Design a protein around this ligand. Structure first.
Ligand SMILES: *[C@@H]1O[C@H](CO)[C@@H](O[C@@H]2O[C@H](CO)[C@@H](O)[C@H](O)[C@H]2NC(C)=O)[C@H](O)[C@H]1NC(C)=O
Ligand SMILES: *[C@@H]1O[C@H](CO)[C@@H](O[C@@H]2O[C@H](CO)[C@@H](O)[C@H](O)[C@H]2NC(C)=O)[C@H](O)[C@H]1NC(C)=O
Ligand SMILES: *[C@@H]1O[C@H](CO)[C@@H](O[C@@H]2O[C@H](CO)[C@@H](O)[C@H](O)[C@H]2NC(C)=O)[C@H](O)[C@H]1NC(C)=O
Ligand SMILES: *[C@@H]1O[C@H](CO)[C@@H](O[C@@H]2O[C@H](CO)[C@@H](O)[C@H](O)[C@H]2NC(C)=O)[C@H](O)[C@H]1NC(C)=O
Ligand SMILES: *[C@@H]1O[C@H](CO)[C@@H](O)[C@H](O)[C@H]1NC(C)=O
Ligand SMILES: *[C@@H]1O[C@H](CO)[C@@H](O)[C@H](O)[C@H]1NC(C)=O
Ligand SMILES: *[C@@H]1O[C@H](CO)[C@@H](O)[C@H](O)[C@H]1NC(C)=O
Lengths: 84, 313, 228
């Protein structure tokens, strides 16, 4: 009955990549942990369960552009990044 | 420059046997070939999404330009996104999409990870960053600055003093707008500029068609309809004939998966080139002569295309 | 200098903790090793495949049959194993091509990021590149790019040029910014306002043609000291 349990019930969600079962779709947007396809991604979140969601591309940021506004940095931070 | 290809995948057992249990039993003798072959296709499939990620995901924040497009006279309407349109593709991205123009035998086409809408969103974000903050957003946080000033000191990278730009702002604006109009006409015209992407699509399509067509070949067997041999022949002679057909189909798949690997390596050598081109020609100002288009490079704008990217230098 | 040194040392400490952490950013090298092991194991397991022969142990065929039929059975085994070797070798060539391309890119990275300093944005790591230190690793190389990232930005009002006595003025290297009441010329990547003078600017034509020019007094360093 394991395959029957993971085929029936309300935990079913249609998607362009195919039918997803077992996971629960949510409206919150987060970074793509595991790529499913067609922008949908899955991750483990709080009890704990396997959620499905539209991957968030990132935080939106409306730049305050104007014909006379300029931003100048008043500090700096030395950083190190590893590459392999 | 092309960036990826259709994420194709094939069920080895379905293509070789198509539900024939006898053929499957014979295929068991060949061992891990189906797993290893399908393992090779999965790698290519992941490679496509990796390439697209390395090309367009270089921006960490989804910037957006304000509604007051007072860019010192420069009209950037043709490249900015169309809010009145359902898809948020730019105007020039509508000509690109319109200009560019199987499952039966176990073949499958997985959808790309990133949809066209999100790809267009990344392009719009990059345009917003380049238009409103120059190269500052590439290195770190986006710093707003007037576009006229950006172009002004961008000329310092070409050894020309900014006084020339400020003295000829109107003329530069007119020339830029006219040039944009020429690009619009060129893509709107019958020009074959998009041949590079069309060739990739056609190559993969005809390759798949060749693979399907190969099934009709008997490879020296009495016939190509698998059920026909099993109907007309008893199990003893059927084994030698079905073995020949199995060998032929396996050979075809091997040829199909070997060409795909080579074509994937090439298209990923192109992807890396595109990524470096975007990082240098969009997020900065490269002194490398003729790298970012012919002539001294000022800036570049990227525009989404099917399976590729189109740069306006 | 002191702040830069402390930041550098702390950055190295963060790198040490990140590498020693339970996570692993070295997945790329691990993939190469795993791929080679995968191919080798597949090639080894292929030996047990019979390929339609009565048995995969060649000695059994040599002992169970007489040569007039053993050559046929052996021919089947020959075909199967030869095909396996061909596939394995071809895959090795393709992987070799990928590794060589990565190696060449690494060599270019070494020359342009460790020896010198590269103007290519985003090539030698994220942000403005300062230098890079290489480190050896099994079957690969690890680059520690040291980069400069500006921070703590502030809003400022600006004008592209300054009009002083009809003649336009432009900044030699900096840009003109104001705190809301007083204008200043300052460095492009680090706020350091200085009084606008004839030494940090150059004149080019009339103000009337410059769009957005803002009238502002320009200081002369010679006249305030010419007491004669
Ligand atoms: C810019 O910010 C830095 C923050 O790193 C200031 O220097 C100090 O840095 C140490 C870490 O090495 C911190 O513990 C101190 O709290 C920081 N002090 C300050 C004033 O934040 C640096 O002085 C700042 N420079 C300015 C204000 O331009
Ligand atoms: C900027 O360009 C756009 C697109 O060309 C202009 O929008 C239309 O332009 C056509 C001529 O190409 C006119 O016939 C239409 O009347 C224009 N419609 C609009 C929205 O006004 C736009 O006018 C141009 N000006 C700017 C800077 O927005
Ligand atoms: C912006 O800076 C100017 C010039 O420094 C300020 O005006 C004062 O000017 C005198 C002479 O230069 C200085 O000794 C004072 O330090 C300045 N006052 C201050 C508060 O800096 C002007 O007031 C400053 N305005 C702002 C927004 O702080
Ligand atoms: C800068 O000064 C010039 C000259 O004063 C301004 O143009 C106008 O010129 C006439 C004739 O000299 C004067 O009567 C006006 O008073 C000037 N207007 C102003 C606002 O001063 C020019 O407009 C000034 N620009 C700025 C930004 O103040
Ligand atoms: C979640 O998204 C669906 C999509 O149609 C919408 O109908 C629903 O109202 C949303 N719920 C919340 C809480 O946002
Ligand atoms: C600059 O000013 C605008 C308008 O007051 C504001 O929206 C923006 O957040 C400011 N930027 C910074 C960095 O303070
Ligand atoms: C900047 O924009 C404002 C508002 O549109 C306008 O009043 C002002 O004249 C503009 N200045 C320049 C130099 O374009």
């Amino acid at each position: 009955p394991t395959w029957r349990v993971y085929s029936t019930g309300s935990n079913v969600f249609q998607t362009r990549a195919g039918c997803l079962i077992g996971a629960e779709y949510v409206n919150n947007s987060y970074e793509c942990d595991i790529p499913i396809g067609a922008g949908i991604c899955a991750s483990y979140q709080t009890s704990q369960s396997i959620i499905a969601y539209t991957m968030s591309l990132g935080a939106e940021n409306s730049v305050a552009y104007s014909n006379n506004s300029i931003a100048i940095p008043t500090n700096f931070t030395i950083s190190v990044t590893t590459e392999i | 420059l092309p960036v990826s290809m259709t994420k194709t995948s094939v069920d080895c057992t379905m293509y070789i046997c198509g539900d024939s249990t006898e053929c499957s039993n014979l295929l068991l003798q060949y061992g891990s070939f189906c797993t290893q072959l399908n393992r090779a296709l999965t790698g290519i499939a992941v490679e496509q999404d990796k390439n697209t990620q390395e090309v367009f995901a270089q921006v960490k924040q989804i910037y957006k330009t304000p509604p007051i497009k007072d860019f010192g006279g420069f009209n950037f309407s043709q490249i900015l996104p169309d809010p009145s349109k359902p898809s948020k593709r730019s105007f020039i991205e509508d000509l690109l999409f319109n200009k560019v123009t199987q499952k039966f035998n176990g073949l499958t086409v997985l959808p790309p990870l990133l949809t066209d809408e999100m790809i267009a969103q990344y392009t719009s974000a990059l345009l917003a960053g380049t238009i409103t903050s120059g190269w500052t957003f590439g290195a770190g946080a986006a710093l707003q600055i007037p576009f006229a000033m950006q172009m002004a000191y961008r000329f310092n990278g070409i050894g020309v003093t900014q006084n020339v730009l400020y003295e000829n702002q109107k003329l530069i604006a007119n020339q830029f707008n006219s040039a944009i109009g020429k690009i619009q006409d060129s893509l709107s015209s019958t020009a074959s500029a998009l041949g590079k992407l069309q060739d990739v699509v056609n190559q993969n399509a005809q390759a798949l068609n060749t693979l399907v067509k190969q099934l009709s070949s008997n490879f020296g067997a009495i016939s190509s309809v698998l059920n026909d041999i099993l109907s007309r022949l008893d199990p003893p002679e059927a084994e030698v004939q079905i073995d020949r057909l199995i060998t032929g189909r396996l050979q075809s798949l091997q040829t199909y998966v070997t060409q795909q690997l080579i074509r994937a390596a090439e298209i990923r050598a192109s992807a890396n080139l595109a990524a470096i081109k975007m990082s240098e020609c969009v997020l900065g100002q490269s002194k490398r002569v003729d790298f970012c288009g012919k002539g001294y490079h000022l800036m570049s704008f990227p525009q989404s295309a099917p399976h590729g990217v189109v740069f306006l230098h | 200098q002191k702040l830069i040194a402390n930041q550098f040392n702390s950055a190295i400490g963060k790198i040490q903790d990140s590498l020693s952490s339970t996570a692993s950013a070295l997945g790329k090298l691990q993939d190469v090793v795993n791929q080679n092991a995968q191919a080798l194991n597949t090639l080894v397991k292929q030996l047990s495949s019979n390929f339609g022969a009565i048995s995969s142990v060649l000695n059994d065929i040599l002992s169970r049959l007489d040569p007039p039929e053993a050559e046929v059975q052996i021919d089947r085994l020959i075909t199967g194993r030869l095909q396996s070797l061909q596939t394995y070798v071809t895959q090795q060539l393709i992987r070799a091509a990928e590794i060589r391309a990565s190696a060449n890119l690494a060599a270019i990275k070494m020359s342009e990021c460790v020896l010198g300093q590269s103007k290519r944005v985003d090539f030698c790591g994220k942000g403005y590149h300062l230098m890079s230190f290489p480190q050896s690793a099994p079957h690969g190389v690890v680059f520690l790019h040291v980069t400069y990232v500006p921070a703590q930005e502030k809003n400022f009002t600006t004008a592209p040029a300054i009009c002083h006595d009809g003649k336009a003025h432009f900044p030699r290297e900096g840009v003109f910014v104001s705190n809301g009441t007083h204008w200043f010329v300052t460095q492009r990547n680090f706020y350091e306002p200085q009084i606008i003078t004839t030494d940090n600017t150059f004149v080019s034509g009339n103000c009337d043609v410059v769009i957005g020019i803002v009238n502002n007094t320009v200081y002369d360093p010679l006249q305030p000291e010419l007491d004669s």
